Design an enzyme around this catalytic site. Structure first.
Site, PDB file in Angstrom:
ATOM      1  N   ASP A  39      31.462  18.994  -2.572  1.00  0.00           N
ATOM      2  CA  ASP A  39      31.873  18.274  -3.777  1.00  0.00           C
ATOM      3  C   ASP A  39      31.414  16.812  -3.758  1.00  0.00           C
ATOM      4  OD1 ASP A  39      33.023  18.311  -6.199  1.00  0.00           O
ATOM      5  OD2 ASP A  39      35.041  18.878  -5.468  1.00  0.00           O
ATOM      6  N   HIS A  69      36.686  13.814  -8.131  1.00  0.00           N
ATOM      7  CA  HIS A  69      36.639  15.276  -8.139  1.00  0.00           C
ATOM      8  C   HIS A  69      36.845  15.873  -6.746  1.00  0.00           C
ATOM      9  CE1 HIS A  69      34.857  19.171  -9.749  1.00  0.00           C
ATOM     10  NE2 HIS A  69      35.755  18.801 -10.651  1.00  0.00           N
ATOM     11  N   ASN A 161      32.843  26.241 -16.450  1.00  0.00           N
ATOM     12  CA  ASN A 161      33.722  25.878 -17.550  1.00  0.00           C
ATOM     13  C   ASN A 161      32.962  25.988 -18.854  1.00  0.00           C
ATOM     14  OD1 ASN A 161      35.681  25.154 -15.591  1.00  0.00           O
ATOM     15  ND2 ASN A 161      34.857  23.066 -15.407  1.00  0.00           N
ATOM     16  N   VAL A 177      30.128  36.188  -3.001  1.00  0.00           N
ATOM     17  CA  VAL A 177      31.136  35.138  -2.834  1.00  0.00           C
ATOM     18  C   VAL A 177      32.268  35.392  -3.821  1.00  0.00           C
ATOM     19  CG1 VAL A 177      29.357  33.555  -2.121  1.00  0.00           C
ATOM     20  CG2 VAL A 177      30.125  33.508  -4.501  1.00  0.00           C
ATOM     21  N   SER A 224      36.780  24.445 -11.500  1.00  0.00           N
ATOM     22  CA  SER A 224      36.656  23.721 -10.248  1.00  0.00           C
ATOM     23  C   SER A 224      38.015  23.301  -9.689  1.00  0.00           C
ATOM     24  CB  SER A 224      35.719  22.519 -10.442  1.00  0.00           C
ATOM     25  OG  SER A 224      35.859  21.979 -11.747  1.00  0.00           O
TER      26      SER A 224
END
Length: 279
Positions: A39, A69, A161, A177, A224
Site C-alpha cells: 500500500d 491509505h 471500486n 488469490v 480496499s
C-alpha cells in the site's frame, strides 16, 4: 475476548447479524502471524500499532505514509482498536506513492519482494498479504499475485471500486488469490463494489473507521477497506490453526455468513467474512 463499541465491520465479522457493536474474537488475536500491507506504507509510529508495525520496503524516496491509505488498512488488519488480528505483526510495503497510485511494475516488484522477504521473518503461524489496490486487467499483475500466493502467502486483494465485474481488474481477477468485495453496515453490497464470479468473499468496506496518518483516525470506504478485514481474519484463523495460507480463502468462504447480503448480482458469491467465534 470482546471489544465493546468496536467499529461496525469488526463487530460484523464476529456476528451472524448486522447492527451489533461488539467484536467477539479469540484472545490469541493473530499472534504469531504476519501481514504485509502492500500500500502507501504504514505510520508504524501510530500508538494503535503498539510497536507491532514496521516498514520493510519502500519503492519511493521515503518509507513514510504521506497518504493515509496504507496506515488505514494496516489498522484494519491489526491495530488494537480497529484491527481484526490485534496481535499480528504488520509489515509495510510501500508500492503506492503518497498520491495513492503506483506503476504496475512497482506493484509486481513489491509482491515479489514479499514472497522473498517472508523467508527472513519469524511468522510461525503463517503469512498474509493484504493488497488494497488495483487497476485495469494485467496478466503480469495477476501472475505476480499468483506467485505470491504460490510462495505460501495468503493473498487478499480488493475487487475494485468500479461497480463493475471484477474480471476486468487486477489483481482482482487472479483466480488463485482471495478477491474481496465490500458490504455496508446494512448487509448491502457497497454501492461501489465490484462483483463477479472472481469474487471470493465480501468484507466490511463502507465507512470503515481505522488509523490514519498523524496519529489520527478516519472513516473511509472501499473494497480496499474490506480487503484488510479478510487479511486480518486470515491472520486470525491461521494463528488459531484453523487453516493455512493455501486454504485460508476457501476456509473463509466455507465458514462465511451466506445469503445475508443484498444487491448481490447473480453469479457472485453471497458470502460475508465471519470468524465463527464462540466464547
Amino acid at each position: 475476548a470482546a471489544q465493546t463499541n468496536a467499529p461496525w465491520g469488526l463487530a460484523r465479522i464476529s456476528s451472524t447479524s448486522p447492527g451489533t457493536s461488539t467484536y467477539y474474537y479469540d484472545e490469541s488475536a493473530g499472534q504469531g502471524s504476519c501481514v504485509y500491507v502492500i500500500d502507501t506504507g504504514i505510520e508504524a509510529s501510530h500508538p494503535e500499532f503498539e510497536g507491532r508495525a514496521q516498514m520493510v520496503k519502500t519503492y519511493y524516496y521515503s518509507s513514510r505514509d504521506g497518504n493515509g491509505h496504507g496506515t488505514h488498512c494496516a489498522g484494519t488488519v491489526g491495530s488494537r482498536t480497529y484491527g481484526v488480528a490485534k496481535k499480528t505483526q504488520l509489515f509495510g510495503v510501500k508500492v503506492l506513492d503518497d498520491n495513492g497510485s503506483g506503476q504496475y511494475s512497482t506493484i509486481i516488484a513489491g509482491m515479489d519482494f514479499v514472497a522473498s522477504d517472508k523467508n527472513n521473518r519469524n511468522c510461525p503461524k503463517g503469512v498474509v498479504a493484504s493488497l488494497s489496490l488495483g487497476g485495469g486487467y494485467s496478466s503480469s499483475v495477476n501472475s505476480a499475485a499468483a506467485r505470491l500466493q504460490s510462495s505460501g502467502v495468503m493473498v487478499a486483494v480488493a475487487a475494485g471500486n468500479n461497480n463493475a465485474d471484477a474480471r476486468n481488474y487486477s489483481p482482482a481477477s487472479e483466480p488463485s488469490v482471495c478477491t474481496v468485495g465490500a458490504s455496508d453496515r446494512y448487509d448491502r453490497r457497497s454501492s461501489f463494489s465490484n462483483y463477479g464470479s472472481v469474487l471470493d468473499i465480501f468484507g466490511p468496506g463502507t465507512s470503515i473507521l481505522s488509523t490514519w496518518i498523524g496519529g489520527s483516525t478516519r472513516s473511509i470506504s472501499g473494497t480496499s477497506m474490506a480487503t484488510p478485514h479478510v487479511a486480518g481474519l486470515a491472520a486470525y484463523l491461521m494463528t488459531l490453526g484453523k487453516t493455512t495460507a493455501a486454504s485460508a480463502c476457501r476456509y473463509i468462504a466455507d465458514t462465511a455468513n451466506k445469503g445475508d447480503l443484498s444487491n448481490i448480482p447473480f453469479g457472485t458469491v453471497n458470502l460475508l467474512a465471519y470468524n465463527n467465534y464462540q466464547a
